[PDB]
């Protein structure tokens, strides 16, 4: 069934599942041509495939060369995403293959389903949640590896850093979606909040600063706070 607030704790049970987000797969800039017509230039993009229980992120980098000589690129993006997700599952040992894949956008259902025909026992599900995974490219280290890539490339991260050493998956995922929500609704302010203090560093093998427990409490409140201010500005409420 479709994933929603009701069946939300199912994310953190012991059935393996992946979220797949395709919002950053086909990225362009729009510009004007000499003759004044509009043209797009593609830039490198990514499939954001995440295990919400473990934090394991399978960032599949989509090099612009994939688009060369192809038509209907936004439609092709969905099929390429499905082809790469499927290839990822085939690459995984059987005991690591997911039992569900949850796509953040309903247009991915038919492509993934078609590509996953070889895995009838993997359930492809939509979601009613409004997840902020599009903001993944607001995370400096992920944007950097995507933009530097010269070939297709899979890069593996733990998007929770070492948080699970100290908090539950449930809490880790809420923190992650809170941060990404904030980065989405007001990137500049969100990033300011994370980095204002020069004495709280990001480990070379991490994505986020090494906040202590109490500092995470303050940070989250600052992120909360930002998101509701923005909602206030956006709806004149």
């Amino acid at each position: 069934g479709a994933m929603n607030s009701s069946n939300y704790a199912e994310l953190f049970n012991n059935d393996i599942k992946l979220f797949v987000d395709d919002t950053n797969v086909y990225r362009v800039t729009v510009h004007k041509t000499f003759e004044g017509n509009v043209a797009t230039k593609a830039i490198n993009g990514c499939i954001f495939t995440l295990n919400p229980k473990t934090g394991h992120l399978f960032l599949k980098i989509i090099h612009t060369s994939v688009w060369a000589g192809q038509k209907r690129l936004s439609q092709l993006a969905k099929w390429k995403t499905a082809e790469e997700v499927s290839a990822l599952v085939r690459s995984l040992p059987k005991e690591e293959q997911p039992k569900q894949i949850i796509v953040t956008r309903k247009a991915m259902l038919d492509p993934l389903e078609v590509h996953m025909l070889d895995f009838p026992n993997i359930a492809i599900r939509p979601t009613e949640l409004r997840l902020p995974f599009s903001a993944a490219m607001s995370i400096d280290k992920l944007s950097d590896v995507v933009m530097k890539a010269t070939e297709p490339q899979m890069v593996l991260f733990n998007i929770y850093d070492d948080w699970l050493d100290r908090i539950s998956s449930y809490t880790a995922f809420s923190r992650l979606t809170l941060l990404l929500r904030a980065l989405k609704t007001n990137e500049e302010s969100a990033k300011m909040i994370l980095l204002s203090d020069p004495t709280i560093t990001i480990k070379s093998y991490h994505l986020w600063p090494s906040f202590t427990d109490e500092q995470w409490i303050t940070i989250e409140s600052q992120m909360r706070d930002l998101i509701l201010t923005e909602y206030g500005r956006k709806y004149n409420v």
């Binding site: 092709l76 099929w79 082809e83 038919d110 492509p111 389903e113 078609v114 590509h115 025909l117 070889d118």
Partner: protein, 300 residues
């Protein structure tokens, strides 16, 4: 011309023959239907005055034997049967005609409707979809489910339509996922036409039988099967030109014959809007598009 005599009419019933129908009263002296045109399949179907649900009936071809109808008070239905004694049967027919207790198959000579609806339907293929090989004729009703319906219970009573599924390995070649799903040509032409049906006439034939079961019996899974077979052609970029033109004629006469009051239960909005306006073949069904627009603009 051929005859299907009736032993009696013990219960009030609306009798259909092909696209015609007659109300018969309880124990009205009714003894059959005459002047049935040889050369096509036919269907005789019953809706009891007392059970407005349950439609039911028999597909037959008068060339394959002498058939008649007999009410069975145990099972509560008009049953088709075969008379092997040719002499005994001509005798019954002649006497009833002499007594003029038979209605005449009421064909207008201008009218090719039934031919047009049944052009590719052949009794031999019907008996493969409705498997009951002790009889030369085939019983269909309102409740019978299809094989594909059964996969998602009693197989003896199933409609064994050819299974079409757009998200299956059958339909999708590995490595041509996107191509085959957006452009079903390989599934239509290689898998279904060359592979399973062997030729377009068998495919059209099943398409037409499914339609007729859908609109005469109110058989839900027949309507599903008719729409799927339309969608497969319309969603193929490469169709033989002779199939497109024959398809437009086939659908035209089906839409034309459609009860106006059942237009919203027998025509799937999505499928029709996609075939007529989005699909590869949007421009290839002029007659069908023109009758759909003038008769059911609401659905679109």
């Amino acid at each position: 011309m051929n005859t299907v005599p009736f032993t009696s009419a013990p219960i009030e019933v609306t009798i259909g023959i092909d696209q015609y129908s007659f109300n018969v009263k309880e124990n009205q002296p009714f003894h059959g239907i005459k002047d049935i045109p040889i050369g096509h399949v036919h269907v005789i179907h019953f809706q009891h005055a007392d059970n407005s649900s349950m439609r039911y009936g028999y597909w037959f071809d008068c060339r394959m034997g002498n058939f008649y109808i007999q009410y069975d008070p145990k099972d509560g239905l008009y049953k088709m049967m075969e008379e092997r004694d040719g002499a005994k049967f001509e005798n019954i027919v002649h006497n009833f005609k002499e007594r003029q207790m038979m209605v005449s198959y009421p064909k207008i000579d201008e009218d090719d409707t039934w031919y047009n609806l049944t052009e590719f339907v052949q009794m031999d293929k019907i008996r493969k979809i409705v498997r009951k090989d002790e009889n030369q004729f085939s019983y269909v009703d309102s409740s019978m489910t299809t094989v594909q319906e059964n996969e998602l219970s009693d197989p003896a009573h199933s409609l064994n339509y050819t299974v079409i599924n757009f998200k299956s390995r059958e339909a999708i070649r590995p490595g041509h996922e996107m191509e085959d799903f957006l452009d079903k040509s390989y599934y239509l032409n290689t898998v279904m036409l060359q592979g399973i049906f062997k030729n377009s006439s068998n495919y059209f034939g099943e398409l037409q039988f499914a339609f007729l079961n859908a609109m005469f019996f109110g058989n839900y899974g027949s309507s599903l099967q008719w729409h799927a077979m339309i969608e497969l052609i319309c969603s193929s970029a490469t169709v033989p030109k002779h199939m497109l033109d024959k398809l437009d004629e086939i659908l035209y006469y089906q839409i034309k014959t459609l009860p106006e009051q059942y237009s919203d239960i027998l025509l799937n909005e999505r499928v029709w809007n996609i075939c007529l306006y989005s699909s590869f073949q949007k421009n290839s069904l002029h007659n069908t598009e023109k009758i759909m627009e003038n008769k059911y603009p609401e659905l679109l």
